[model samples]
Every structure is written in structure tokens, then in C-alpha cells.
Target chain A: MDLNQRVCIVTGGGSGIGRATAELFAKNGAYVVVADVNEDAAVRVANEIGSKAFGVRVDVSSAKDAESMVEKTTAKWGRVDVLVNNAGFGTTGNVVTIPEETWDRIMSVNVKGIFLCSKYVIPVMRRNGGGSIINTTSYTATSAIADRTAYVASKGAISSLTRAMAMDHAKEGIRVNAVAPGTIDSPYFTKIFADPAKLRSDFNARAVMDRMGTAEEIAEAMLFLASDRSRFATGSILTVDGGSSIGNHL
Target chain B: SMDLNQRVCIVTGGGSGIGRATAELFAKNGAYVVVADVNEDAAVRVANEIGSKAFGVRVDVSSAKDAESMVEKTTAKWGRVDVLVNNAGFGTTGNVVTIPEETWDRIMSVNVKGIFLCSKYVIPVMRRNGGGSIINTTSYTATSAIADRTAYVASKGAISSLTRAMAMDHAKEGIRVNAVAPGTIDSPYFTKIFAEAKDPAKLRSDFNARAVMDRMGTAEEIAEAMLFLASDRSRFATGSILTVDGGSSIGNHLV
Candidate 1:
């Protein structure tokens, strides 16, 4: 998976799976643009990755920010070969009691972020002759868990949109795919839970692997989809769940 | 995805096409591979080509004895089995009423039961080694139909379901079960189909145009996916069907 000078933009690149993916891409010889809503965190990660990387801040939910994110990447690299629409967040709430504001916000960032990013990036990809787009979905998209109604819904939408985008642009040489990760130990989860240790154990037990997946595992999936190693794959959701969605029979 | 150093793998249908490519690749990546096929000559040829790290076995997947012995031979030499590429299977043309019952049974025997028999024997070896990976070769027709492939589609559908069922059954034991769904691939089987066609060029073009890539996928491409699943890089992926179809199952491509 030698990316070798291919320009890649990874959203949510400040931390977690995005950060791991950005780092992995860079290590594989790709020039990486680490885009995150947090400017300082993104810049810090980019700096840590050395000169092959550049950091930028762009709230993926905002149309202008999304446009600017692509523009900045194109201006710097002259061509974009891969775009990882990985920026997303989840909140705890049931469908009935979840506030409308919270639902809209989750949809805005989790769902709309992919939309806006792909909307802006597709033109650049068309110009470049072809490109790979990888979206971050969750294992919950297919096998739903409780209380996080909006988050699951957003992921389901992402899963469907991934296939739709692949169909729409296949003739143009653009390959769109998504990675659905199971329960992961990331910064996002660390901040959300009050008792992270117990929560971690609970989630770990839920996976067949008997542990929460690391960000690097998910990042490896991203790299496969980002490179020509997966040239025959498009509109596909590479499920990186440790048998979580397969149902517990044993 | 990176390397398979010290790994032991058994690939069914290793005589030609996807299985042959996978055996060659795994051996190149430092794996001890068993190129098992129904055709003894093809298997030996492939295994010999890969040099000392690999060997060949004759296996008719539909035969229970054959499946069991294939695993036995691998463990006898390798001491343990690490990966099983259940790539043996064939497709036939005909709808339900038109297809003979014997044909359906035969297809299911090799395509679906082959995995069951192989896993039945290999699972024990894998458990002793702490875990292993099983990669099945299904088809895009398992989900999306192409006309006149009723038996093939049914067998693949069972494979897709069996993939999930086995994943749930053995996941705790660390055995990961997954399948690779390929679209129209330019393999020997397809080459034979084109040869039989009345107008080979036109038929070939139709097959090529079925994919959004406007070309058939190479056997090496499918083999690369198998390597990912066989390696530790896909540790979290169990019960997954990694579709290597070039946008064919996504939707219609008019062009």
C-alpha cells in the first residue's frame, strides 16, 4: 500500500481513527492534509507527522468550510487523490426523548459532513481523472444498539450514501466506499463516558475479539480502501467489526 | 495486509485462476501454502512453481474424505493450520425449473458444504493455534442476480449466510470467518465462457461493461483482498463480505 505522493485529506485528523489514518497514509508515502475542526490539535498532529503533512481547520458541517478544505488541499498539493470523510460525533439519547436540537446537530456533523466534503471534493477528483473517497460509518449502522438513535441513523445514512455515490461517479473513475468500525477505544469515547473503565469492559465483552479495537486497526482498513489495492472495490462497506454485528449465538 | 511471515495457508481450487494467484501471493509473502485442487496436475504445478514453502494436494471438495484428508495433509507437515481459503466452487447456467436437481445438489455440495467440511476439520487445528482465518469466495450474484444462474446464486447466498453464522459460532475461539464477493473477473472460467460464446468479442464486451470500471477484475486483485483477510491487519473483521465488485452491485451503469 505505497501511496507515494498521492494527496490525501483526512477529516477529524486531530485524533482517534482519523489521526491514525493520517499518520499511516503519511508513513506510506502519501502527502497528507490533516483537517479537523480543532485547529491547534490538527496542527500539532501534522507537525508531529513531519513535513509530509499539513494541518488545517474546517468544520466539516459548514458548506463554506468544506469547500475551503478542498480548496486549501488542492492549492497545496495541486491534486487530491483520496478524501477520508471521517469527522463525526455521537451523543447519548433515545429517539423519543432526544432533543430536536441534538438530533439536528448530530445529523449536521455526522451526516452532512460527508455530504459537504464529497460535494466539494468530487469535482477535484473528476479533474484528477480519478480518486478514492472513504467515509467513516459505525457497526451500529447495520446492527443497532440502544439509546443513541440519532448517531445510528446518521451512520445508516452514510452507509447508503456511500453506495449511491459510488454508482453516480463510477463512470468518472471515482471510487467511493465506507469503513464501518465496531466499538473502538478512541478519544471520542474517552470524553463521553463517566466511568470509561467499566464502559470499556462492557464494550469489549460485546465484541467477539474480547476487546475494543484500536484506532490503528481501523486506519489499516482506511489505507486499503485509499490505495489501488482496492481498485476493484467501490460502493462497498468494509466492516471492521469483530463479529459484533453478526449476532451472538455462542 | 502487509505480510504473512510464518503463516500456514490452504487454498482450495488452487490449480488455476483466483486460487492459484492467492497461493502464489501467500508464498511470495513468506507463507507456507498448500495448493489443493481437484486437478492434481494443476495443484502440483502451482505448488512446484512456489518452491519449497508450498506443496500441492488433490481434493474434490464435494467428497467428505477428500476435505478431511486435505486438512490432515496440511497439519501433518505444517504442524498447524493458520488460514483456509475456501475458493473451490463452480457456477452453472439455468433457472429453478430448467436446472436439474442433481446439478443443484452438486453445486451446493462443493460451494457450500465444502466450506463446512473443510472448516469442520480445520477448526480444531486452528483452535490449537489460538485462532485462524477462513476466507470464502462468493459472488456478486449472491446479492444481485444475473440471469440464468439459479444454483450458483443459491449456493453463494448460503455461503454469505454461513459466513455470518460461523463467525458468531467461533468468534469467541478467535476464528474469523469472512468472504470475498467478486464481480465478473477475467479468470480461466470466464475465458472458457467467452470461448463458448457465439460472438466472443461482443459477449466479452458485455461482461466487461457490466462493471463500472469498464473492465473485468484481475485474479490478482481478488487475491490481494484474501491476503488482507488472511493477515492480522483485518483482525477486527469477522462475518464480513469484502465486495471486490467494481460498482456492479451498487447500481445500473448505463454506459
Candidate 2:
């Protein structure tokens, strides 16, 4: 139980990386609050993990939901220790033709979600002598993938915001870090990729490992950043991309 | 069981500071460690301290001949090499105009070419083993520049790019290349530098205050990061630069 006794809130904990992280953290002895926009899915995961876990509805972009999520967690667990800002969606469009509403929504969920959750959780963490915050960024934050302008922009913002928050809260005993995964094979993409064969061929070929990352693989990273093993690591963007961050095999 | 059970590893510059700490940590984790350094006495001393699981060797990593010999000796003793930590590097304090040309060349040769030479010799061994992890020690200054370190900074920049290139080149061969970019660390070298200052206390405080954490990092902290990268914990990671700087390279402390 690496995360023994730690209280964690994982946004987007209904499926994919978020669900995996919540399950992993709970298995490792953490009291997990599985917060997601899909309340039923969140509840199902929390139920699967037993009494140490609780499910809550949280559209992280909404201040009310973010506050409520943290409030409920503190009420149940008495304090919050780790927050995984893993709620983000990607839209395929260039800067010019992408719907302005879609762009605003992406920014709201991806960028503002972090701001709102941290705004509520920081005080609780401070009272408890600080905690760890792990953000879910993408390899696209530093390197570009075609026709993902809005998603790319949000990820870039997250990368910078991660650094800014790390510096801002370093003295408070809170450590902020990020995991930048490359083309993860998760539900987030399963819905996007229409053809399984092309999905297997295209996404698998992006990394030098010749395979897309699993939700469990990304969960391991979140585990590291959340644990005291990474106490000295603040403002670090831990890229677990199977060499995709450096480009594919030559 | 320890994370590095039965693994054989080589840590260049394993005489002191981060290198020594890493050598010791790897040994503690059940790896057969080779403490290689230009300082023969220091290497021998460290190896002795770590007991029989470690062997000491005098190796000037900048020299291709020395690097080859070191790897050969490691393989001859352990039968296989699983990890290589390119930790032997130093910087002469000066700007472009103030630093001598020889000093510039020395910086690149040791800090940059050392990684190349060591990997050149070790890659074949790793490929034969099916897969292996290579960790390079770069600096935070590679990305965020600080004054009076032009040659050192440039050499580190080369290392950062070279890490990615090497990762791309060898990824298909089951060899993973990654780098650790450390911020200001409170190592023995800096402790001595601070001791020599006019006011050691003030000098030390000034150094400590540079990080967002208001303190310089411990060598053990960096070693923990290295251990993570070396173990199966970070198996999905490659071509990545894991910064363990305590938020020093993140941004300024305006407050």
C-alpha cells in the first residue's frame, strides 16, 4: 500500500486513465473519491473498490461541482491529499474552422478544470500540511499532432500551468507534477477511432515501443507522482510516452 | 526482493556526489555496480565502502579507449550489463569570452562525448540482452540558461538533444535512453565552494534560496529518481528528461 492513508480525488475517474488511477490508488490503501461527470460510472468504480472509495459527480469545469467534490471528500475522509486533474477532451479541428463554442468548451474543461479544483483543494491540503497534485497532460503539449489545434493549445496551457502551480505552492509543502502520455490506448480514444485496425496500426506506430500506452501504464506514473517517492519532484512533466516524446524509431 | 535484483550496472563518475550516491543506492538494491571514475582512489574507496557487490575502475570517460575498456571489464566480470548511468561530467565556470578554448573543448568532450562513447560501447551489450535502460545526467541549465556557463550550457543542450536522438535510434533495438535534469544540488563540490566563500553562511543561504522549495536538493533525492527510471516502474518511459529540481527550473519566486 504505497499510498496508505492518503485521501485522493481523481477527476474523470469514470473510465480510462482516471478510472485506472482511482482503482490503483484505492488498492494501494488510499481513500479515493472517484469524481467524474458521469456519476453512474463513477459510482460503479467506487463500488468495485469497496468502502475505502466513494463516487461523486463533478464536471470539473464547473466551480460548483469542483467545490462540491472536494467538500464531500473532506466530509467523508476528513482531508484531501492528492488531486488528479485528469478530465480533458480532444477536438479535431484547426484554429480557423474549429467551432468557437467547441474551443471555449475545451479550454473550460481542460484548463479551467485544473484552476477550479486546485482553488478548492489547496486550502484543505494546506491545513493538512500540504499534498501532491498530478495533472494529466499529453505528449502533444511539447510536440504537435496534426489537426488537434484546440487540444494542443489546452495541453500547452496545462504544461505551463503545471510549472506555475509548482512554483506557486512549493513552499506550502504541496508538490505539483504532470504526466504526459503519448497516444494512450484508453476509452477516450476508443470512441474517437472508428476503425480498430487503423487505430491499432496508427496509434501503435506512434511510439518507439510500437504500441499505444495502457491506462494501467499511465496509472503507474500517477502513482509515482502522488507518492512520497516524488517528494522532491515539483514542476516536473514526467513524460511516459514510450519514446514518442522524442519521436518514433528511426 | 530489491528492484534491481541480479542486475549489473555501471555508474560513471561514481567517486563522489550524485554518482557515488547512485552507485551506493544501486548496490543497496541488489545490483552489481561498477564504480567508475577518473579519480582512481575515490572510485576504489567508494567500491570498498559498498562491499563486494561493487568494483572500482579508473576511467576517463572522455577517452574512447577508456570507455571501451571499462565496459569490457564490466561484461567480463558480470556476464552482462543491464544499466548504464552516464554521470561523469563537470563545468568550468566562465562565459564564452572568459573561458579558454581548451576549457570549452574539455567541457564538450567530457559532458557530451562521454555519453556518446559510453553508449557506443554499451549499446551492443544491451541489445544482446534483449532490452536495457540508459540514464544520462543532464542539467536544468540545458533548458533554462544561467550566466557564466556558456560552454557548459551548450554541452548540456547537446546532451538533451542527443538523448532524444539516441532514444529514437535505438528504440527499435530495445534500448531506452532517458536523461535526468537536476537543479542546484547540495553536493560535496558545492559545500566546499560555499566553505571557501568570504561568508560561507551567506553564500550557502543564497544558494539554498534559489529553489522554490527554499533549499537545495539532496543527492539521495536524485538517486531515488534514478532508481525509478532504472527499475520496471518507469518501463513505459523513454526519451524523456525527468527534472528533479525542486521547482528551481520552473520559474522565478516573485513573492
Candidate 3:
């Protein structure tokens, strides 16, 4: 309710973290643009969320898509209040094992995607007297896990970028923050871990709470950072990993 | 930076969990420890484990006399009290309607009132010693919330808020006041909490998977943060709710 009538753009809004955030944003009285590469997913999610939400097919890594996504959003609503750069792809393997194509795709989606989206959205937001940008970083940024070559590096870049961006836009009234989630159980995660035991152990290894996290939980955190509740918070990475970053038992 | 040579510290509820961990860590860092707790055997066991620099004391923290006795005895032996870890606390389940009337005050008595009483008596001793560090144990639930446990959440909220307020009140006094907010850390107490679960293994794994990290934070890890807060390493830091939860407050994680 705090974001009543505010216009928001949620990239990768078709599924998982992005979908959850889009729905939550709409519920809080914000008009959401559900942008995803999958046109059907984007439209389905947008429709499911009803009239307050709209869909756009976007390959966030593409400069063209990023520009058009925000333009269409602002043209329809006339202003942008919040931007969630949540569409991302995760890849495994060390530097040597990860293929060049894998590296490029992951980076283009996770890291470059943020840059392109923010590049376009920042100006439109300034028109509205500034806005909030929430980025999704991985737990590996602070505490690195094994065998994730590109995913960790890309998310790490996002975390650092969050700090620099916050400093860059502080005078312009744009608040930049990040939300780091542990391995979420999603399409991306299922592909990463093929074994059931590995999945259990992986999740158990990071979380202190003894349960996996849902997309809604991440959305809840996204909502808080988006709201005025965090007016004084900038450059902070709000971690809701079921307690993954904290040290585990000896 | 965390040198505690010759410093005498009192950690209430030192029988187990975070208190025991802090007491042991302080002892390792060369601080004499008063491991005070309601359970005499548990207290003495921890004291013995930490060797001669640590001693056990029976204290009912909710009682003013007991809280005072704790400080008096520590100063009596060591000549001064250098640090105070006010970590004694308990939690209750159920919300306003479900929780018994007596449960509300009882939880507050141990968690909130206990901290207040302990700080009330220890601050004078600390001021006499010129300055000292006071570290309180708060929880993620302190500033945030979950369903149920209405009384438990309220008590923790009181402690976290008081940490900042007290810091401001005593800013010029050199008595640094701060708190450590832990998510879920493993200890014997946790074992007891999850003991009655229908499937302990599932619960343990589930709890482990709950944190973004994948496992419950160890007592030692929490103790490490407390150690930082209790020592000169954090000299300039005060009134901070140093959160040590494995990113639990940020969002739910599942990898």
C-alpha cells in the first residue's frame, strides 16, 4: 500500500523471483511491467496479476530491449518509481570448465542486464524526482561457494555495482540497494543440481533455518527495500537467505 | 585488536548456548570469566572446561539481588569488571490469544527485565572502572517479525530498541552499549527445541536448508561476533544491531 499507484518495472517477471516481485508490487498498488524473454510467460504472469500489471518480452542483456522496456512503461504510466533487475541466469563449473558461450550468456543476462536496464530507467526515474532500484545478488558474492565460476563472478559484480550506483545517484534522490538470496528452488536451481541429495545438502549447507526459501520470501524483502521503510538504506545488501551468510556450526 | 588481557567479564546464562560460547571465547582471549547461570551444574561444567580463568556462579537474573551479587562478586575478586554479556533469555510460542497470561510476563521477565536489571547493576561497576563494553543478545525477530510468538517478539524488540537508546544515554560515559542479533544458531538448547519434532532428521535438514548458508550458525560463530563487539576491535561501534543471521532477514533462499 505504501507504493500506491507507483509505476514499477520488474525484469524477468515471468517466473520465480521476478514473478513474485511483480505480484507483490501490484498488490501494493504499483503498476508493474512484467518483462521476460519468454513472451508467453510475460503475458501470462501479467494477465494473472490483472490490469495493474502489463507484460513485455525483453532480453535484458540487449540494449534495445532495455531501452524499449522502460520507454513503453513510462509512456503508459508517464513515470517510473521502482525498477527490479531480477532476471538472471546461473552457471556452474570453474573457470576452466565453463565454456566461453556459457560465460558470455550468464554475464550478459546477470551483469550486463543490470547495466542496460538501469541505464535507461535512471533518467525516467529522475523525471519523477528519483526512484528506487533493487538488484538481486547471489550469496556467493560475500561467501563464495565451490564450482560456480561465472555465476559467482557475475553476482559479485552486481553487488559492487550496487554500491557504486548508490553513490553515483545519491544526490539525484535515487536509492540503490541489493537483495542477496541463497540458492532458491527454481527452474534455474533444478538444472544446477541433478541429484536429490546434492540439492538437500546444498540448501542445508547454507541455511540455518532448516527449510528452503520460496520466491515470495525474496519478494517480501524486495518490497521492504522498495518502500520508504528503508529511506536511510542505500548500498546495503539485504540478505534473506534463510541465514546463509552467517557462519555454520564447527 | 580484540586483546582482552587481564579483563574480567561476566556473561549471564553462561551455562549453554551463546553465553557458554562467549564465556569460552573470552577465556581463550585471556579474559577471566564469570559464567553465571540458573543451572549450577551446566555453569560449573562450562567454567571447568574453560579452566582456572573461568568460574561458575548461580544467578537468577530476574532478581535484583542476584544480578547485583554477580557484579559485586566479580569486582570483589578481579578489582574491576571490564565487560558484561547480558545474554540470558527464553522464548515462548503462540500469539496473544493462544499464549497464557502468565507466559507473557515470564518471557519479558527473563528477556527484557533481566537485561534491564543486569545492566542497572553492572553499569555502576563499569563506570567505576572508567569504561566497559556491554553486549546484549538480540534476535532477528527483534526488529522484524514472524507469525505467532507475540510475547517473544515483543521482548526481543524491547532489547534491540533499548540497545540504541542506552547507547545514546551513555554516549559520553565511555560505556559502549551494543547488541548482536543472531538468526538461528545451533546449541544444546536448539537440540531441545527440535527434540519433539515428528522427524528430527527432516527438521534438522529443513532448518539447515532454511538459512541462506545451508546450516545453523555455530555457537562459536556467534561468539566471534560478540568477541568483536566486546573488544577494542569495535571501539568506535555502538548502538549497532550487529546481525549474524545467515542472511535470513534478507530473503528466503533455496539453491
DockQ for the candidates, in order: 0.01, 0.01, 0.01
B143-198: candidate 3 lDDT, tens digit per residue = 44544555566566556655665665565778888899898788776788688777
Q: Candidate 1, B185: how far from true, in Å?
A: 0.7
Model 1 lDDT per residue over A1-250, tens place = 4799999999999999999999999999999999999999899999999999999998987878988988888888899999999899877754234554665577678756776787788888888999999999888766766656556656755665566567667877999899999888876667766666887778787688878898999999999999989999997989998888888734
Model 2 TM-score is 0.53
Mind giving the per-residue lDDT tens digits that candidate 2 earns over B123-187? 87887898799999988776665555655665665566556656666777787778899988988
Docking class of 3: incorrect
Chain B alone, TM-score, model 1: 0.97
Error of 3 at A148 (Å): 51
By lDDT, rank the candidates, best first. Answer: 1, 2, 3
Candidate 2: misplaced stretches above 4 Å? A1-250
Question: Residue A108: error of model 2 in Å?
Answer: 48
Candidates in order have lDDT scores of: 0.83, 0.82, 0.80
Give per-residue CA lDDT, model 3, range A102-123, as digits (tens): 7557756876677678878888
Q: Which ten residues in a row have the lowest lDDT in candidate 2 chain B?
A: B95-104
Q: Global lDDT for candidate 2?
A: 0.82
Among all windows of ten consecutive residues in candidate 3 chain A, which has the lowest summed lDDT?
Answer: A91-100
**TM agreement with the true structure for every prediction:** 0.52, 0.53, 0.51
